[PDB]
Design an enzyme around this catalytic site. Sequence first.
Site, mmCIF file in Angstrom:
data_model
loop_
_atom_site.group_PDB
_atom_site.id
_atom_site.type_symbol
_atom_site.label_atom_id
_atom_site.label_comp_id
_atom_site.label_asym_id
_atom_site.label_seq_id
_atom_site.Cartn_x
_atom_site.Cartn_y
_atom_site.Cartn_z
ATOM 1 C CD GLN B 11 -2.935 1.266 0.269
ATOM 2 O OE1 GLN B 11 -3.510 0.111 -0.274
ATOM 3 N NE2 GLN B 11 -3.212 2.465 -0.103
ATOM 4 C CD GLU B 62 -4.660 -3.422 0.371
ATOM 5 O OE1 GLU B 62 -5.464 -3.669 1.145
ATOM 6 O OE2 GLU B 62 -4.004 -2.657 0.777
ATOM 7 N N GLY B 135 1.903 -6.110 5.873
ATOM 8 C CA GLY B 135 2.044 -7.519 5.563
ATOM 9 C C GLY B 135 2.721 -7.779 4.126
ATOM 10 C CB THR B 136 1.747 -6.681 0.704
ATOM 11 O OG1 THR B 136 0.530 -7.286 0.874
ATOM 12 C CG2 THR B 136 2.340 -7.157 -0.574
ATOM 13 C CB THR B 170 -1.132 3.391 10.885
ATOM 14 O OG1 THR B 170 -0.437 2.284 10.125
ATOM 15 C CG2 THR B 170 -0.814 4.688 10.438
ATOM 16 C CG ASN B 219 3.064 8.857 -0.352
ATOM 17 O OD1 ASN B 219 3.314 8.862 0.509
ATOM 18 N ND2 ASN B 219 1.922 8.350 -0.722
ATOM 19 C CD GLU B 245 30.971 8.164 -8.782
ATOM 20 O OE1 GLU B 245 30.942 8.255 -7.634
ATOM 21 O OE2 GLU B 245 32.128 8.527 -9.705
HETATM 22 N N1 LIG Z 1 4.836 7.675 3.751
HETATM 23 C C1 LIG Z 1 3.638 6.604 3.583
HETATM 24 N N2 LIG Z 1 3.377 5.815 4.288
HETATM 25 C C2 LIG Z 1 2.453 4.810 3.957
HETATM 26 C C3 LIG Z 1 1.510 5.177 2.596
HETATM 27 N N3 LIG Z 1 0.537 4.364 2.848
HETATM 28 C C4 LIG Z 1 0.761 3.517 3.640
HETATM 29 N N4 LIG Z 1 1.904 3.823 4.152
HETATM 30 C C5 LIG Z 1 2.575 2.883 5.402
HETATM 31 O O1 LIG Z 1 2.048 1.648 5.085
HETATM 32 C C6 LIG Z 1 1.977 1.107 6.587
HETATM 33 C C7 LIG Z 1 0.952 0.086 6.808
HETATM 34 O O2 LIG Z 1 1.269 -1.142 5.939
HETATM 35 P P1 LIG Z 1 0.736 -1.293 4.491
HETATM 36 O O3 LIG Z 1 1.849 -0.820 3.643
HETATM 37 O O4 LIG Z 1 -0.569 -0.585 4.432
HETATM 38 O O5 LIG Z 1 0.579 -2.990 4.227
HETATM 39 P P2 LIG Z 1 0.790 -3.621 3.007
HETATM 40 O O6 LIG Z 1 2.115 -3.355 2.334
HETATM 41 O O7 LIG Z 1 -0.453 -3.135 1.959
HETATM 42 O O8 LIG Z 1 0.217 -5.040 3.233
HETATM 43 P P3 LIG Z 1 -1.118 -5.590 3.739
HETATM 44 O O9 LIG Z 1 -1.810 -4.335 4.592
HETATM 45 O O10 LIG Z 1 -1.103 -6.791 4.187
HETATM 46 O O11 LIG Z 1 -2.012 -5.538 2.263
HETATM 47 C C8 LIG Z 1 1.729 2.326 7.493
HETATM 48 O O12 LIG Z 1 2.572 2.204 8.803
HETATM 49 C C9 LIG Z 1 2.016 3.477 6.691
HETATM 50 O O13 LIG Z 1 3.315 4.179 7.141
HETATM 51 C C10 LIG Z 1 1.836 6.533 2.231
HETATM 52 O O14 LIG Z 1 1.014 6.633 1.134
HETATM 53 N N5 LIG Z 1 3.056 7.370 2.431
HETATM 54 MG MG LIG Z 2 -2.486 -3.601 2.890
#
Ligand SMILES: Nc1nc2c(ncn2[C@@H]2O[C@H](COP(=O)(O)OP(=O)(O)OP(=O)(O)O)[C@@H](O)[C@H]2O)c(=O)[nH]1
Ligand SMILES: [Mg+2]
Lengths: 107, 429, 292, 91, 427, 50
Positions: B11, B62, B135-136, B170, B219, B245
Amino acid sequence: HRDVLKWVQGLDLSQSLKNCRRDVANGFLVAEIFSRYFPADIQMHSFANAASSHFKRDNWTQLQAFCGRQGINLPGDLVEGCVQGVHGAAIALLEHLYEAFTGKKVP
Amino acid sequence: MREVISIHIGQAGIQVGNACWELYCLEHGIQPDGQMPDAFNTFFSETGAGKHVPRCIFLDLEPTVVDEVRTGTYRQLFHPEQLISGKEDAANNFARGHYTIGKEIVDLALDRIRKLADNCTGLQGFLVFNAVGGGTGSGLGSLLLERLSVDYGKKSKLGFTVYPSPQVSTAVVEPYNSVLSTHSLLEHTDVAVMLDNEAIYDICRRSLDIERPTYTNLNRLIAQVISSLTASLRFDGALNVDITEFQTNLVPYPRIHFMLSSYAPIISAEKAYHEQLSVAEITNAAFEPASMMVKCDPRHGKYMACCLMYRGDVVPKDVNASVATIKTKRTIQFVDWCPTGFKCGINYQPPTVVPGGDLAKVQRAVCMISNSTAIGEIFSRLDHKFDLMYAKRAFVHWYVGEGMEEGEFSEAREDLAALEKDFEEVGAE
Amino acid sequence: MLSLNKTFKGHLLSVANLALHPTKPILVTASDDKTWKMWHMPGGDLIMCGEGHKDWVAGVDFHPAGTCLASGGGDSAVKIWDFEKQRCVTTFTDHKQAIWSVRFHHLGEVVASGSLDHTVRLWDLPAGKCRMALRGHVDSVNDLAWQPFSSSLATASSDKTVSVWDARAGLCTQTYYGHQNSCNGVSFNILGTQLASTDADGVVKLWDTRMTAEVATINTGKHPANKSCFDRSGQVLAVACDDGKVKAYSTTDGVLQAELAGHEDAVQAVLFDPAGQYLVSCGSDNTFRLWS
Amino acid sequence: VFVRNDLTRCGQLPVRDMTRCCQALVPGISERQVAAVMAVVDPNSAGGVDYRAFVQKLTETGVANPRMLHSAPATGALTRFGEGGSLTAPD
Amino acid sequence: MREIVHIQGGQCGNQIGAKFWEVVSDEHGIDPTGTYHGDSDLQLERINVYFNEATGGRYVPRAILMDLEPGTMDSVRSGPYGQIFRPDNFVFGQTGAGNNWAKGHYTEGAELIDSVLDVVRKEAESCDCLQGFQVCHSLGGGTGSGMGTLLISKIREEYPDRMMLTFSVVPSPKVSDTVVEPYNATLSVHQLVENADECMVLDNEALYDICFRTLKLTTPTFGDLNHLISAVMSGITCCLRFPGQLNADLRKLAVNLIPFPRLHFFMVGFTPLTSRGSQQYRALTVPELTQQMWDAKNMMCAADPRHGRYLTASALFRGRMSTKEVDEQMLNVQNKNSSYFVEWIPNNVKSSVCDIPPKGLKMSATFIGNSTAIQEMFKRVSEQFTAMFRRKAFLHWYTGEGMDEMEFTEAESNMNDLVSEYQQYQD
Amino acid sequence: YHRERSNWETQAQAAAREAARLEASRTTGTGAKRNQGSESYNIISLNYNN
Ligand SMILES: Nc1nc2c(ncn2[C@@H]2O[C@H](COP(=O)(O)OP(=O)(O)OP(=O)(O)O)[C@@H](O)[C@H]2O)c(=O)[nH]1
Ligand SMILES: [Mg+2]
Ligand SMILES: Nc1nc2c(ncn2[C@@H]2O[C@H](COP(=O)(O)OP(=O)(O)O)[C@@H](O)[C@H]2O)c(=O)[nH]1
């Protein structure tokens, strides 16, 4: 008792006993025991594990027909008690099968 | 030619990639329709006539974030086969994303990389965006980087990873997911740039004067950090830097590949007109602890190596005056065995300004990526968190029943503990 | 002071047997799910687990040092596992009949094992071969135990005979037929003076080593009692029942003293922790709940 | 930003001044784009609107996802929290 | 694409389900006829999670409505949005449980449990990948409690990897609708522990507290309580049906709210519950949602969160919001009162941000919380059960259906197992 | 539908009648005649009331 509990554990059935009277009521466990003792004659594919009265009667009717063909005898009164869920009929059928399949004694 | 393949996992990967590829299509003038109305070859493979496609894959288990790219304002830009979505997510479980639900989707991911790798002649490296708190991102990002090392040997990998914050986070099982993912990126990722969302939250609050920052705000200025790292490959400059480099002037040991980040000019337009952004004034804002993109104190540690990525109207003279005045400042501190710890990189293009971002139009900019011993503080804070939860086996049956064995928790704990020991003794006098 | 305070679960089928570490607060249980699981009393969580048995694990046992844990299964397999590295050192499958119980020696060098071939064998962890085999029962040997000091080996079987033997020379010293039915478990005292026999009659009979004087005779529930143990305090005897009750009988206070009916199914294993206040009980309900 | 660009402490700023404020807040807004929101906020105003009303209307009519702006150019099930069996009507 | 199969039991589940399918189909833009009348494209993107596309473009809900009283399914045909349901899924009995757990679970429920599994197997195989099974029923009744927990036992054995959602309403402390509630409640929660992946506790007299103190409803209709229940159940499945900045399905909520497998009993509450008199005076802001969410009077269980410490928590935020300002409210609520939060779980609160608000509402939130204070309403039922069972009263209507007195001691001990393990985390 | 609409109409009519009574008492000035000053001018700043 302990001998029939050891015997039902040794067959390694999928169904766990716990409350054995309610567990063996559907006929799936006795079908599994009969299938282990006769792999070619009785298969688990021809039996449905459900609490329905009609499916229970179907499973016990197949079991009765095949054991009547093969000579192994269990009481029809005990079958009726098992499908009606009266206390002790399941136990008595379990020791009757324990004596019938591989013959030992009851204390 | 020079080419980089960006791989976004999870995500955080998709939404950072949405802001990143928004910026890259604006730098080269690529419309969202996908047609430009020779520098684009780093990030875009020109397919036939009148079409430029991204050299990226957007993979997440997802579908709910892959599909919003497929129906957003960038429908016609991305190749429809490079956006990979699964049935159900890993759901904040490292065991799911690594072993059970992640193995049947990484085989399609390696096939898409192989088509992307064979198209480009000279591949500079893989840029990996993932979130170790998810998770992912932790799980599938681990198994993908395991396959990238064994199949594409000696090719550089850069990890722009989002790491959990000390104060606010979160989710609940992030200390489990981040600690297990530490061993995955310690032996495999050649460059690991630590990003902490709380630090970028505090960057936005004091620089952009935004009281309620959002993930989209975060982002957008992460993308300016990624763009300035690769700005020298795309556009010519006085002091060119490459991906190869970048490693050799930052990492002095194979097991130390963690670096910070800081983007110094971050101003709104009301800030911008009253600010005379000079090279020396901007460079002092780069080494400011408040401008760091990860919640650690460089005063607590000491600098090991640093990289200065200058853009725009920067003369090669006053960059050296900014380096000299930084070295004489006693607030920073360098290891005694790296007397010349600076890497200077100057490009001749000002950064692009996205219509929709809080950043103003600036003439010069700096991205400063530094390796220091203060990163031992970052892992030590979640070391206490993971040891607190694992001590009574909370949130473990979700992992044990999903393929993973119990011994993988303690092995990742000892691996993280050994990483702390290395950072303390290397910077020691 | 015997009530329900903590519960331990994690098995799909019925729990066959259980034991505790010799000087640690950890309980290792062997169930019909073909696995052996170790759990911690103070937390209720597992610490170690071992799998690899083809059939239901009939019983488990531990040595006095606790380094090697033996597990006898229904597929005639005796597996010895070391807890320090979670490695199964040996897997003896020389028997072709179902194994019931095991008992390590005083020094832990060799362990006796009972099978359904109406014999008691002796197996060594390093050698992996039968050192001595004895036969003194017409039915399957349900339990075997050794005295703390001498070579008094007590074998209990379904032939209603408790045999006190000298297994070093491969001979049986004597056999006592006090039990009126099949015997499942023989539990010694702190020393080797007194041995209590389980039976299908449901009586806790504590005979002497050779005098065999039933000092106290008590009654249990309607179902046959299967497992017995003696508390280290020297005044409490715990007896499980297949009717769902665990009875703590006092030696000097009115015979039967306490009844615990927290369990719901047949209980096949009972023991006491080394502290002396808590008991570890098993059952056919897949809940090895430790009574306080 | 609007207060800082307001030189007379009016509470109102003209179209060019508010275009400058909007461009300062985020670069890339056209003067026509600002003036359309001017006309939406205050139709009968000759020149200049309340910037408080402008900011208030934009913040009240803002949305999270750019996809769901397309419906902008029946009350709701959850918005009532009462007449629970009167949700919708027969025929 | 992550489908949810809804199953309703008894008079309560059909009445809860009737209001649930009214609310969800309203925000999806689905009329009682079966067509689509929405004004936004976001509604049709993820609609297969709750509605099956049929011939002619009609959408039919993925609902299986069951009860042993045949007149109650006439009440759901008579209710509004009652013709959207498939007539085949309306599995019906003839006799009726009559507030007997044993009649619904062994004697009279067994003849109907084959056909309920017949349509559940048909409905699960139709969709691509299941995400879970959602059930709403009672614990004090005989059909929702007896036939419900047999169904939950059956579908957990057949489908073990799929999630379970039980919006089970539990018997009340103050005033009870029926005398035999503790017999049905204790036997239902015994089957809920080893079967339900997560359970969400509702109480009717906690709902009356919401309608009186907060909503200022002088005479709350019995369907107004189902409006509050339907507002929460629509909020749990928010991130699946709609895109958002931070997504969280039912599995991600389970892995964050459940530290240990048996502690899967939650208490929930929907946030923006405001009266029409006080509608104009409250600023619909994120801080106004957060502190009202954590208030004790909002939560729809009789157990007070102030008594015992929070083990975990979950927040599901919907609408136009800021991620930092949502998250900083969660860090603030863990520090201003740190005694009510457990110490060996850092970051007890999970948060998800969804971008599509409920229809007609600018911004909403939903709370889910695992607390050790939920044992107060299980010890109370155990207090009710130990009084009745010790004198063996009201028991001949249970032992006449096949079960014995030993099954009562199974549920009595397993109820006391759950309150034992909850209590030792309160210390 | 008619039964539940009648229930909500009774609730809303009670609320609207209370609001109408308060609005009438505010407009006619009968309410808070305890707190109404005399002499019909502002006693602090000597200006006529409106
Ligand atoms: N800086 C930043 N962090 C993000 C953003 N979106 C999600 N995150 C980070 O993602 C973390 C939550 O885990 P996810 O990345 O959502 O989990 P996932 O990789 O989708 O894996 P699953 O939830 O099992 O599908 C949070 O702690 C956020 O810090 C974003 O747009 N910007
Ligand atoms: Mg996710
Ligand atoms: N909140 C709510 N509770 C209900 C509803 N219908 C019934 N109940 C409660 O459910 C309990 C009775 O359950 P019942 O419908 O008789 O279950 P059954 O007989 O097993 O089908 C009572 O305590 C009611 O308060 C409803 O629509 N909403």
